[PDB]
UniProtKB/Swiss-Prot annotation, chain A:
The organism of origin for this protein: Mycolicibacterium smegmatis (strain ATCC 700084 / mc(2)155)
Broadest EC class assigned to this enzyme: oxidoreductase
Chain residues that bind FMN: 14-18, 126, 170-171, 212
Gene name of the record: nfnB
UniProt keyword Nucleotide-binding, yes or no: yes
Any one Gene Ontology BP term: xenobiotic catabolic process
Record protein name field: Nitroreductase NfnB
Pfam families the record matches: Nitroreductase
Activity response to pH changes: Optimum pH is 7.5 to 9.0.
Source taxon at top rank: Bacteria
EC number, UniProt record: 1.-.-.-
Function: Confers resistance to antitubercular drugs benzothiazinone (BTZ) and dinitrobenzamide (DNB). Inactivates BTZ and DNB by reducing an essential nitro group of these compounds to amino group or to hydroxyl amine, respectively, using NADH or NADPH as source of reducing equivalents; two electrons are transferred. Able to reduce the nitro group of bicyclic nitroimidazole PA-824, but not of quinone menadione, nitrofurazone, methyl-4-nitrobenzoate, 4-nitrobenzene methyl sulfonate or 4-nitroacetophenone.
Induction of expression: Transcriptionally repressed by MSMEG_6503/MSMEI_6332.
Record keyword rRNA processing present: no
Subunit and interaction comment: Homodimer.
Amino acid sequence: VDLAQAAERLIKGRRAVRAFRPDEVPEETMRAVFELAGHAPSNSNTQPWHVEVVSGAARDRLAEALVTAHAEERVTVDFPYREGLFQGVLQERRADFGSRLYAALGIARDQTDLLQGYNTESLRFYGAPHVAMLFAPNNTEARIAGDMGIYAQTLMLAMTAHGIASCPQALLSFYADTVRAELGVENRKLLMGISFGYADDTAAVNGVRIPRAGLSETTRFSR
Amino acid sequence: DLAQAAERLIKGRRAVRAFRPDEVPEETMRAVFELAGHAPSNSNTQPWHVEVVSGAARDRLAEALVTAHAEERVTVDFPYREGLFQGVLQERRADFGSRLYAALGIARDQTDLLQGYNTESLRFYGAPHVAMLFAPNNTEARIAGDMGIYAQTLMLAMTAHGIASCPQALLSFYADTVRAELGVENRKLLMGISFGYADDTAAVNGVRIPRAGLSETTRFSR
Ligand SMILES: Cc1cc2nc3c(=O)[nH]c(=O)nc-3n(C[C@H](O)[C@H](O)[C@H](O)COP(=O)(O)O)c2cc1C
Ligand SMILES: Cc1cc2nc3c(=O)[nH]c(=O)nc-3n(C[C@H](O)[C@H](O)[C@H](O)COP(=O)(O)O)c2cc1C
């Protein structure tokens, strides 16, 4: 494999996978992936990421604790919402994404109980055998969060290289106190979780094709 | 195989601080920026707006930045405050600075050499191109996280085509200058990425910045 071809395969090949098989990723592969991900750059080489990887019985207890917290409305999010977050084209993109996702799931926006069933499964990591919880410093702001994103993408691409499917999930960060309590983590903020393992390629949700805006919408070249 | 290629890309990408004058071919530049667009983001919002500057426009921009710095016209959209980094994060920052300044041959009390180096950084380290990464006006942690996902996708796509890069928060400290020179309004500047082909004879390009061990950043439980 030539480098240019490999980058295209990894970058386009990585997709948000929402249905996994139960098979675990070998421990040596997980070590190789997370070691590689640590090579992400960051402001001043600060490497602000603290990553909690959960498997087996601990992963099962964590999934049940998230389902229970969600049922009890114990929302404990570390990052507040900012008014007007998605205006204009950002809102159009979110609406189009939601439309494609629900169409692949075979659910209509008015089918509340089916949306509930789907979201309960999301808290069970879509059946993934592993989850990586991406913790950040208590004083995380835009620059540190940018580095958390550099790391998240490095990790997802290293996973893709090993045939490991992933789903980045902001949803898991909405129950940060539950994750911290389960894992014994103190004084860190939870930005997102990444469910991972091997994709169930028979699931219609994994057939969803999410477009991108393209150069004219995002990029300008000047000289 | 793909596993080896990922290792080569991820480990091969380094912050390059001395460039050759040679421009990236137009078709390669378009391929790299189109590929970077495949970065994921919350709800597929793709909040990035990227201004790629080359040639005379890049020269005018570099000179405007040098002038803004000399006149102390610092304009920051995202604060970079003292105490942003504490504990081990502050020590990693100090350790990085020590390695960089040793490669540059600049001592602690050398203000004139430090000024000359800062001027060269505002000239994009001689890179023929710079990508300015603009974010929405209301950017907070989650949107900034997506900007980082994009920035790393772009740097890795560049590395795959043998294109060296340096992500630079420094360029975001003169946000009004960048906006005025590029006709950009109502977007915040998070960082710039200088890019082109590495000058392999430059001592600064020999620096190798380590990472904390896997045991230091990651915990596995079952
Ligand atoms: C930081 C971040 C948070 C995300 N949060 C969720 C989430 O909570 N649940 C979910 O189903 N997908 C989530 N997504 C996945 C996307 O919606 C997805 O990346 C986008 O639709 C682009 O599709 P693709 O990744 O398949 O190319 C998240 C993506 C990112 C980068
Ligand atoms: C968001 C971001 C901002 C950065 N700002 C600068 C900068 O202003 N000037 C600079 O020389 N390097 C800057 N760096 C580059 C690093 O310091 C570098 O990525 C870190 O030391 C790790 O080294 P490596 O990328 O060579 O592996 C920045 C890196 C990132 C990811």
